[PDB]
Design a protein around this ligand. Structure first.
Ligand SMILES: O=c1ccn([C@@H]2O[C@H](COP(=O)(O)OP(=O)(O)O[C@H]3O[C@H](CO)[C@@H](O)[C@H](O)[C@H]3O)[C@@H](O)[C@H]2O)c(=O)[nH]1
Ligand SMILES: O=c1ccn([C@@H]2O[C@H](COP(=O)(O)OP(=O)(O)O[C@H]3O[C@H](CO)[C@@H](O)[C@H](O)[C@H]3O)[C@@H](O)[C@H]2O)c(=O)[nH]1
Ligand SMILES: [Mg+2]
Ligand SMILES: [Mg+2]
Ligand SMILES: [Mn+2]
Ligand SMILES: [Mn+2]
Lengths: 250, 250
């Protein structure tokens, strides 16, 4: 419908694929009018890609190890940054005029199509260092130029933790001090999970399972309808997975 | 010199007094041209007030337990909020046109007089919930009206944790979405202490020892010039305390 605009996510393996399936199913559930796109690598199994195609309108293959890939020369300088370099291809999707990137470890609790009212680069503050934006949810404008500049910066600067957040904050360095409309409310990337969430946590639009253990790393027990050691968000992830993802398998 | 403008802090006991002495000494060290004010209660010992008068230009006594105090009726509704109600008296200081409130558990690493270029209410984002501002450092305009409204809100709403942050964020509820100039850089209230601090943590202007254990709760050992179990900020606090506070005692 709005074929010109997309939610874009990323998976480089079958584990994070499970996250993308929950994310995508949650966006469908809350009736997005936009396209759903997943960047996938050849490390994602063919069988899992078949499941991704039931949720996503486009499963777009990216392989930074292929010498024909635009990021390949950069990977040879920074071989440790394969995942980040795959992610940056989100900017190469110039068939779309505007997109919202979302991490595969996010989950949507309401329609968030009003994010397309925003301009590049709009993003929520990161907890822990809130003059940096968290790069798990952001509104951007695909551009070969912007893409090539991000590649250059990745080449020059690298990434201590292998993430793209430092690079995106270096490139978009006016975010902290310029144009409050480019600060997404924290409820669009609620990543503190693990008094304020009493008052405002009920109005979350997006939950982000930022940090070491992802929901799919838990062992789910049908017998108790919970995981094994606000646990609510974790339960909701698994609720979407069991109710909405599993039956796509028919 | 700028007798019209002040840094204002707060202590209700001799422990936090030690914090105020380090804060005040750090502001002097970095050559503030503004006045230094501490709100103190009768629970602060006379002997400690004599030490506070060597650092602070005004030691202003506030006693919410006195029926002549403006906050006393509010305290009888909310007897658990004595400290917060004392703090709110910062707005009653109408001999000043503009002030920066700072928590007694902060410490200054550079001249921060450029905070007086800001307008009420300017404050840094709180880590953990960054659409709320942390109420440990803020620029405000003393006003009997604003004061009386904050008292009313404290009366109506109370405070789950006994802090003023919720009240100040409720009253100043446009902060997250309005006027980026009212967002202080995080380096003016660096309260994550305990990759980003590698890049930007060297340029801190204010450190805030937010959380349970305050620097003065540690046991300092002259023999090692450290505390007993970035530990640097903690060492600096104790460096100011031993070098700059102690010899005020002559
Ligand atoms: O092996 C991997 C690792 C990551 N991803 C994708 O990359 C995203 C980011 O990884 P994630 O594990 O979610 O990182 P966070 O725990 O969210 O860590 C934070 O810090 C990093 C920035 O430096 C960013 O990658 C994250 O968006 C940011 O929230 C994931 O959601 C996936 O979409 C993969 O596909 N495969
Ligand atoms: O017994 C006390 C307790 C606090 N204070 C003063 O109140 C300030 C705030 O208390 P603090 O212990 O610093 O709280 P934080 O650990 O900083 O906790 C956070 O959350 C609270 C808001 O709800 C605020 O009081 C703080 O500014 C905020 O940073 C202190 O610095 C002192 O100035 C006293 O004088 N006596
Ligand atoms: Mg360069
Ligand atoms: Mg009212
Ligand atoms: Mn993530
Ligand atoms: Mn404090």
């Amino acid at each position: 419908s709005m074929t010109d605009q997309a939610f874009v996510t990323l998976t480089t393996n079958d584990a994070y694929a499970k996250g993308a399936l929950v994310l995508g199913s949650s966006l469908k559930q809350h009736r997005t009018t936009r396209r759903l796109v997943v960047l996938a690598t050849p490390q994602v199994s063919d069988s899992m890609r078949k499941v991704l195609e039931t949720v996503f309108d486009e499963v777009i293959m990216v392989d930074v190890l292929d010498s024909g890939d635009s990021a390949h020369l950069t990977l040879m300088k920074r071989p440790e940054l394969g995942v980040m370099l795959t992610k940056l291809h989100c900017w190469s999707l110039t068939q779309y005029s505007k997109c919202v990137f979302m991490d595969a470890d996010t989950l949507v609790l309401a329609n968030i199509d009003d994010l397309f009212d925003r301009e590049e680069l709009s993003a929520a503050p990161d907890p822990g260092w809130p003059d940096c934006f968290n790069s798990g949810v952001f509104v951007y404008q695909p551009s070969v130029e912007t893409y090539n500049q991000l590649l250059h910066l990745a080449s020059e600067q690298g990434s201590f933790d292998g993430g793209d957040q430092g690079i995106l904050n270096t490139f978009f360095s006016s975010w902290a001090t310029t144009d409050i409309r480019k600060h997404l409310p924290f409820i669009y990337n609620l990543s503190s999970i693990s008094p304020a969430f009493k008052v405002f946590g009920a109005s979350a639009k997006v939950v982000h399972f930022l940090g070491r253990v992802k929901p799919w790393n838990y062992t789910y027990d049908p017998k108790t309808k919970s995981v094994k050691s606000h646990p609510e968000f974790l339960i909701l992830w698994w609720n979407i997975f069991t109710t909405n993802v599993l039956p796509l398998l028919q």
